[PDB]
């Protein structure tokens, strides 16, 4: 039912969940196994949260129309499917960790663990904050 | 129609010679000539080829699409050539080649020799492999089929000549 | 084949082709689905 009106609506209905929470994820379509990717998206839903939308309506034009209002670099979605997995208690939580650790094993591929960084800042990951 | 509404990307390194409706190409490998149908119009336009409906004919686009496909096949023939692989399931089915006349040993009762047409290089990498190469899709396919028709595969074991990709529909004889 | 005076698609992989005017059913799944004349 990914029609034009449902797209015009779910573009914002999927921009909102990643624009109020943390970064989301994306998972390609290469090879999901009877155990690996099935039970892995299972444990994804289990630990990550019961709000993540592992579905993918991530057309390049639908993205540029809906999501690009904030963090306008979403229309490069020529790449494969998206398993959108946000995070509740702050940014880069267990969902982001699982996606980034699944891009290399325990799944087909996680499309470089796309993520959504509102800053698009200089070249440094979020690791310069010890105590 | 859709295929006819598309340009043939004729690379640099092959000679294109269109005249009237008779077409001629000269690539690295061979030389290919064929007169298109009267209802087809051709033009080069800077390192490509076009095919459209020459006026006054109903299936102008149909003939143009056929001609586009033929000219692409000729271009890729003279560019990289074609290559048909054939296999021989069946006891003692040799495909010895001498000159350019394959000596098929399918053991009917008698020798069968297949005179190839001009433009087919028929080597036999193994005892039960044929590799017909050359620069014309249609004649290579037609000679490969004239071969395979000697012993079309059977349904019960698959005995006979087959294309390298041909999936045979093997079936069970009967209860007994 | 079958020379039924009414050829129909007996399976899903049957196709209706009209070689030589004669309307034929050719099926690349089951060879018993090969019919001749519409």
């Amino acid at each position: 039912m990914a029609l034009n009106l449902q797209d015009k609506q779910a573009i914002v209905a999927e921009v909102s969940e990643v624009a109020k929470g943390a970064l989301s994820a994306v998972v390609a379509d290469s090879r999901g196994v009877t155990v690996d990717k099935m039970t892995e998206l299972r444990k994804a839903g289990r630990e990550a949260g019961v709000y993540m939308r592992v579905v993918r309506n991530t057309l390049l034009r639908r993205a540029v129309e809906g999501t690009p209002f904030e963090c306008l670099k979403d229309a490069f979605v020529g790449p494969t499917l998206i398993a959108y997995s946000m995070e509740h208690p702050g940014a880069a939580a267990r969902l982001f960790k699982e996606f980034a650790k699944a891009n290399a094993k325990f799944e087909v591929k996680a499309a470089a663990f796309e993520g959504e960084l509102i800053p698009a800042s200089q070249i440094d990951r979020l690791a310069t904050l010890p105590t | 129609s859709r295929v006819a509404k598309a340009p043939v990307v004729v690379p640099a390194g092959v000679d294109v010679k269109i005249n009237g409706q008779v077409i001629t190409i000269k690539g690295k490998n061979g030389e290919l000539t064929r007169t298109l149908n009267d209802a087809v119009e051709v033009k080069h336009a800077d390192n490509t080829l076009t095919f459209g409906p020459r006026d006054g004919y109903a299936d102008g686009w149909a003939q143009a699409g056929t001609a586009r496909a033929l000219l692409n096949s000729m271009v890729i023939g003279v560019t990289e050539g074609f290559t048909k692989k054939l296999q021989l399931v069946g006891v003692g089915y040799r495909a010895a080649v001498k000159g350019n006349v394959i000596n098929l040993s399918l053991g009917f009762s008698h020798p069968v020799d297949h005179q190839l047409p001009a433009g087919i290089t028929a080597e036999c990498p193994t005892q039960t492999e044929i590799v017909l190469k050359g620069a014309d899709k249609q004649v290579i396919g037609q000679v490969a089929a004239d071969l395979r028709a000697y012993r079309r595969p059977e349904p019960y074991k698959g005995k006979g000549v087959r294309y390298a990709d041909e999936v045979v529909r093997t079936k069970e004889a009967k209860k007994k | 084949m079958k020379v039924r005076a009414s050829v129909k698609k007996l399976c899903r992989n049957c196709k209706i082709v009209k070689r030589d005017g004669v309307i034929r059913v050719i099926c690349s799944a089951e060879p018993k689905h090969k019919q001749r004349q519409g």
Binding site: - | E172, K174, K175, K176 | -
Partner: protein, 202 residues
């Protein structure tokens, strides 16, 4: 084995068909005794004191039963003696005129086996005779299950156990007795001559 007395007159040891009479045989020899009117196959000949039994008490079960009738209704004595002698020779080949009606029925182990029996009857004990007319359990390779069951369902055959062992598959089937008539040969061509069965009156 029989607990009786046998005696010797001619001892012959020679090629397949020829017979070279000798005087005595020692241990490790193979010869043919004569007039031995009592010992059946697998029974032990020995001096009055030697082994009561020497193993070998098992041979297969016939698998094919057919009836038979000579050209003239009254040569059935000739035929019965022929098929008592041939049955003595082949312990895997029975004969019993089943007293259901009267019919003299012949149980061998194969179609060609029974052909051999009938032509030996016509040639040696010359009587030209024309042949005529439960919970089954079958083993077979686990590739011919589909056809053997298609064959069993082709016959009025209901089944009992869908159990597969390890070197094959054990099929159990309830089929008529007036039926199957050649189930061994049908099965052998069907199973690549690699199956056994049994049909003993459920």
């Amino acid at each position: 084995v029989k607990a009786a007395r046998e005696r010797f007159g001619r001892i012959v040891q020679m090629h397949a068909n020829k017979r070279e009479e000798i005087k005595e045989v020692r241990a490790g020899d193979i010869a043919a005794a004569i007039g031995l009117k009592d010992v059946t196959t697998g029974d032990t000949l020995c001096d009055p004191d030697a082994p009561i039994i020497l193993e070998r008490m098992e041979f297969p079960e016939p698998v094919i039963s057919i009836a038979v009738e000579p050209k003239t209704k009254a040569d059935q004595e000739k035929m019965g003696l022929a098929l008592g002698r041939l049955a003595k020779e082949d312990p895997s080949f029975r004969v019993w005129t089943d007293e259901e009606s009267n019919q003299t029925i012949i149980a061998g182990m194969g179609e060609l086996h029974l052909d051999i029996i009938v032509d030996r009857m016509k040639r040696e004990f010359n009587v030209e005779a024309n042949v005529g007319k439960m919970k089954v359990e079958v083993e077979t390779p686990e590739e011919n299950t589909g056809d053997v069951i298609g064959d069993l369902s082709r016959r009025r055959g209901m089944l009992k156990g869908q159990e597969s062992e390890v070197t094959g598959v054990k099929i159990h089937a309830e089929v008529p007795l007036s039926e199957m008539f050649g189930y061994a040969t049908q099965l052998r061509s069907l199973t690549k001559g690699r199956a056994s069965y049994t049909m003993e009156f459920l």
